[PDB]
Design a protein around this ligand. Structure first.
Ligand SMILES: C[C@H](SCC(=O)O)C(=O)N1CCNC1=O
Length: 167
């Protein structure tokens, strides 16, 4: 049994809800919240901007030290950092950004990072300002992630479209 409430069950392991990921993280304090990161961990907008703002910029400070030591992530890659006030840990995952011309086949590699964690609160990777089709992102999620993933869809209109179109 876990703390997550009000989710629709899509599959054995994937759940979805119309929710503000910061507000959901603040309520649940999950072991892992996933950030929609870029390779530079520059948390300017979308999920990264929101999450970072909710940490009062502590996520960005920690991220800048990580990059100064380790250099950029790979597209499709991830790192584990603090969850600050939102979660125990934040898994920063880099999905391909279609608005930068990155290969969408890298979306499956991105979701494979979730399999290193038994339970996660996450957004749909590569959706929103990353330019990919959220319907596609949900399909790749379901077909890739085997651990228990609780997806927070920001937009109610999009949430309803994702549920109604789910095969
Ligand atoms: C990846 C999403 S796109 C819209 C969606 O999930 O419907 C995004 O930009 N944001 C901002 C805050 N929470 C989010 O998920």
């Amino acid at each position: 049994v876990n703390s997550f409430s009000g989710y629709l069950k899509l599959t054995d392991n994937v759940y979805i809800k119309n929710a503000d990921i910061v507000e959901e993280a603040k309520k649940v304090k999950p072991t892992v919240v996933v950030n929609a990161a870029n390779v530079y961990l520059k948390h300017g907008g979308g999920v990264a901007g929101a999450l970072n703002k909710a940490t009062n910029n502590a996520m960005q400070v920690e991220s800048d030290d990580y990059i100064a030591t380790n250099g950029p992530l790979k597209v499709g890659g991830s790192c584990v950092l603090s969850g600050h006030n939102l979660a125990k840990h934040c898994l920063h995952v880099v999905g391909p950004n279609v608005n930068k011309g990155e290969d969408i086949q890298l979306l499956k590699s991105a979701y494979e990072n979730f399999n290193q964690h038994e339970v996660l609160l996450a957004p749909l990777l590569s959706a929103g300002i990353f330019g990919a089709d959220p319907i596609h992102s949900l399909r790749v999620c379901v077909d890739t992630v085997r651990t228990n993933v609780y997806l927070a869809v920001f937009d109610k209109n999009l949430y309803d479209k994702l549920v109604s179109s789910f095969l």
